[PDB]
Design a protein around this ligand. Sequence first.
Ligand SMILES: Nc1ncnc2c1ncn2[C@@H]1O[C@H](COP(=O)(O)OP(=O)(O)O)[C@@H](O)[C@H]1O
Lengths: 152, 141, 155, 50, 194, 279, 52, 94, 67, 286
Amino acid sequence: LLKLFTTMELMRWSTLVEDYGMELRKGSLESPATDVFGSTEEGEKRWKDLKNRVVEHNIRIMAKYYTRITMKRMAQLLDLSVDESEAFLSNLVVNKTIFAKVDRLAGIINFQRPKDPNNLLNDWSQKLNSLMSLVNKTTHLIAKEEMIHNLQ
Amino acid sequence: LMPYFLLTQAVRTGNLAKFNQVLDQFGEKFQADGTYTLIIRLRHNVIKTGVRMISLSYSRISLADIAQKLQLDSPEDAEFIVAKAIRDGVIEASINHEKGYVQSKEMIDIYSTREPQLAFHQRISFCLDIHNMSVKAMRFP
Amino acid sequence: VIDAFRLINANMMVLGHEPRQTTSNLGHLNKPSIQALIHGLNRHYYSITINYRKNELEQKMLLNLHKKSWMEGLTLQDYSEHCKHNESVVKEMLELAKNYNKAVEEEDKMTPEQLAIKNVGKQDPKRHLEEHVDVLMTSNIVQCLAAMLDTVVFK
Amino acid sequence: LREELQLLQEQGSYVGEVVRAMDKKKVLVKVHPEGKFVVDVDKNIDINDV
Amino acid sequence: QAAELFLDTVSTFTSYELMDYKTFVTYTVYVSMIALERPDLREKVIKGAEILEVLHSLPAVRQYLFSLYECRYSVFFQSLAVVEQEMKKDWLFAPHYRYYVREMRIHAYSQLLESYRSLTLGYMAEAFGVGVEFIDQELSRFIAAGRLHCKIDKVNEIVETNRPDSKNWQYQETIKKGDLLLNRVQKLSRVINM
Amino acid sequence: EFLHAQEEVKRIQSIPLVIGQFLEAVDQNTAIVGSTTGSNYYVRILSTIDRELLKPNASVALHKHSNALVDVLPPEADSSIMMLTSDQKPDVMYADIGGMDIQKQEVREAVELPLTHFELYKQIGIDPPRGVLMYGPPGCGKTMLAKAVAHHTTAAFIRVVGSEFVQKYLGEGPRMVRDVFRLAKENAPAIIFIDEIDAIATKRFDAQTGADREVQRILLELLNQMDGFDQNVNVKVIMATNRADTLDPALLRPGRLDRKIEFPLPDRRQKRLIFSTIT
Amino acid sequence: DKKFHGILDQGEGVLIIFDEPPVDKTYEAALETIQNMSKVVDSLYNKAKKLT
Amino acid sequence: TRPANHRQLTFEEIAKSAKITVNEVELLVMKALSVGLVKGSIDEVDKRVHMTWVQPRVLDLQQIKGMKDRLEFWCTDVKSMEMLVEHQAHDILT
Amino acid sequence: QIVGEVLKQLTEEKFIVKATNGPRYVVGCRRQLDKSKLKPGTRVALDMTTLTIMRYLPREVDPLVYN
Amino acid sequence: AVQKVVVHPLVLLSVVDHFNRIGKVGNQKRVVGVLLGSWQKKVLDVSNSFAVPFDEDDKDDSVWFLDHDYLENMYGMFKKVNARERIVGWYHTGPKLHKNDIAINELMKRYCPNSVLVIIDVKPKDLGLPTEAYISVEEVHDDGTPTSKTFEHVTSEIGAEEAEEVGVEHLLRDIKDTTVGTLSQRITNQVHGLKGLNSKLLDIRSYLEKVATGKLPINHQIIYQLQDVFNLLPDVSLQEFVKAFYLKTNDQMVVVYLASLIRSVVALHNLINNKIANRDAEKKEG
Ligand SMILES: Nc1ncnc2c1ncn2[C@@H]1O[C@H](COP(=O)(O)OP(=O)(O)O)[C@@H](O)[C@H]1O
């Protein structure tokens, strides 16, 4: 849980099946684990469910980190080929979980909404006002520390 | 203006003999007006005008095609004409001695939205001269 | 309103009344209210003149320090509400377009002042004057100049 | 106009329906909130102007 | 203006004035075809029940009207030539070289190459009739005329359109009107001070 | 300096306003207004606001302590609620009604004026009807004709509700009649629909009991407004009553309201038709 | 029918889909203002008062 | 050291800075975003990393000359542009 | 605070609040409150002197007979 | 513990007058009293002031006296006449703060738990600062630093007291510190904004220079933590202007078409009307 919950780590299930997959073979009791994944038919169905689940998890964590990632690298990270990776990307976008736009002939993706110039200059002005407030606070701080330091 | 209309049509088309005939017919008034030297200058710059219009029309037009269109019948003469147009700067048609490539346009840049306001903000200058004329022309008695 | 007066005894009225003394100063801007006039006060003796101790070291301190806007003139605000504000400005000045239209076809040949007095419309030429268009222009150019000044500062 | 606003702060004027114009510059009037308010006459209008 | 005041299907007589109600409808169809291309024209004229009835009465008229509406140029051009021939047999032939077929196909070509960027000449020719050279010369002539916002890559025989964005095209319209009104205000400055 | 002074004197406050309805602009720089608590007094009109929104009998805004003309509130329906623009909304279209006709031909006659035909009222020389009273019981709905028709030909529809109107706002009753009449005049496709007249609004056989004089004055102002309409536009007015006997002759007389329609009981054949239509 | 926002690039055999910004209606509104505030006034007024 | 002066943190620049391989760049920049070192956009077509820092630390006060120089550069630019706009505005301010 | 009802919201800044006993005023709204909390036709409290919205209150009716 | 304080334009002049009236015989330059007010929503405000004569000696800054009975009676009277008013802090003039402030805070905090200090510059009007606020924090100077006093400045902004606008307008009635004359007033706004920016940033540059020289103790532990982000924030990239080449330039050009042209056209209309009137008068006078 500590590994797979947070901090957006690369959930390569091929690595996980041995790094944290010991519950399948032998653990403390491994009985719920054998019920879930150690089964044959429903077990393999739940194995595939882990596989895709981690695929969407990797896609989601990549969404908040990488703006444009090349198709080969994304497919390698998803442990699938180009067509399978684009199919799962489509499966996410039709669910509206991610804001993704892809050039299929170029095979290049983008996750950032086109910034309208109105709010672009608005955040620019907010940055300006943050800088102005920082100037005010720094001025007061340095002037007062100057007073305390020339109290000699 | 009827012969002037035919002159405009000849300028657009690129033909020579028809407007030469009409000049030989009714060019005496042009001489009286004093534009007959300019008249012949247009007669031989009809190809330049047609080249400008066809360059505005086309993106990558063949030099052979433009020569055929404007009755040049010569690839080298077509190349020279497009060279002369680009050095005159009337059009943006360039030369690639491979086949006659010409660049296309681009989306709007920093100054492409500002050149109208830059060339038009004399509106307030007109307003101020109008107000000063009023100040001069508001005598009470 | 800070109006100060004095109560008088019965003798001031039986002597030469209006206890206002012989000078031309308390007659300056001396407009007692109707209720003050109908009451004895502000009518018994006089109305006192008011003055404010606008001494320096005090008034300069107030004007310099209290009404304080000192680094607040650097605001940029290019389009925080200004895209829709410009939409609204265009709609208002389209209403002005209709108004100035209406005026130019009114434009009667009978000394148009005669038409205008009886057909006031409070249009762009008459009441929605060039001052409002100047306000719009000043807003636009102020945002423009702030943005451009900070753009050239951005080095 | 600002002084007019300050006068309107005291309601400005009061609407009165004139009835009886007495000789001593006096008109009874009727005011909708209350009614008759016997009062003097203005300077711009004579007793007969009522 | 003719369309805006002429769609009104309130005839003073059942069949009079303009020689028929059918002739009235043919005038309406011609005027609308000159008027626009294909916006909610479906909800403006196509929705017209009397319109659909009279197109049932006139199959060929219904034929070219539906051909334009469906944007099927293969039948559209033949039907449009038939329309021009019919207008020839009509005294209302004032647009003899401007707005019989050239304006309608200007609208049609705008409609076609818009939502397109680089449609090949050879394939747009067979999707729009035959004679690749005929379509090429028509495109060249109309681009010279001014409409059909596009350019022709002759060395590769491609139709590279240049559709301005909403901002770009409207910007262009504003600068054109600014030119016209600067001309106007200069004329008015001439009017003053004389 | 003078530009500074001009742009400085243009402050006019005007944030904390109050509402007291205007009577009329007698002249420029003079006026007469009636506050919400009455107290009709003559005021001074500033030049900032004028005829552009200074319509005769519309509710306006006044300064908190100065009662001076500052602004005129454009909306009129929500001043006292009493329903609003039931237009642009198909609730029950027309033929979907189960009551078939009852008559409904006099009601299509009443919609002729909303259905343009004001031009055809002239030329032909006819005088189209203006007031349509329906003195029927709740049978036929008596409002399925006004919820419809208003949508059959797109036109504004107002519930008015007579029972609500008779209340403490009897002094503001005239003003709200003016406001709703103005809302109707604003939209020539509009029909006023008044409900529950019989039992409360101006019964003529039981003597005036207290606030009954207020109701009679309100009805008098309604008559004044319907007479000032005087076929100026194509809006229409229809009252719906269970019994017209107690109604005042002033509305009942021809020249103000003419068409009396009775909407009877389900009419067993028509009742079966209604059952089929609803089911 | 403007139900989609793209351009069919047949030469590349694709369709470039573009997100159209519609907040640019200020442009068209301003053009309408220019038209109906200048045409209706200048020509009429200064053709009526040709002599001044 | 570079206030967005060099805002193109390409793969080769990252290799010069960290002597790290290409596949480890992804994990390194991920952990950088997680901790708070760089919060900018991470591309891979050009491998450009945008530069925003929100976790300041010791800046080697012996090397405060660099930030002093950048601050005085900003001062000179601001004052120069103020004087330039004053030159353009004498027609109102004089 | 005096008790009134939201006769009309008018706009985001100015609102029409009618006292239960006559006068209605064009007032501002409480800073902490929002229009979603104010709403039309809901009981509110105006400032006694400055005449601005201070708090909005729920209302109740009671038949109080044979309950 | 308070998030921030907001100073009213209601106590500053009162403090200045108290300084003036009690400095007639007390030339210690040290005016010490209490500022009363209210703290409600992490925003502290001052509504009343009081001054007490106060004498200092430079010997360890422990020589002083006050009238605590009279001050407490004042506070009781003020609370009786207005219950919401409470002592929000204590104020001392002489921005060069001495060492008795800790003792004064320790003694007066029985009236206010989050005891704060307020400095009023009666004579100085440096740029626009009327007063400064000070919060007492002695909970360890820093993670790896020795013990210190460390009185920090809680952020202060001049508030907007009600009903004082009438009085201040009547008082000044000469400068009109409002947006009147919009264009020129905003020009002045830009002017003194640039003045303040240049002065403050020059002060920051001087502080950096003096830290580099090392003549003064270096409070780097907050200085770089607050200024590194300021410096590195990417407001220098111009490719966002490339993306927004029509940032507002469309609005600039529509304003050129529709404000300058509209002014020119209305001025032209006025001029041609005046010309017609003058020509008709000249022709028909006789
Ligand atoms: N198709 C229909 N035909 C007739 N009446 C209907 C139909 N559909 C609904 N109604 C009923 O008509 C009723 C209108 O009654 P109401 O307006 O109270 O009567 P009145 O107008 O006399 O006061 C509604 O309550 C509704 O249930």
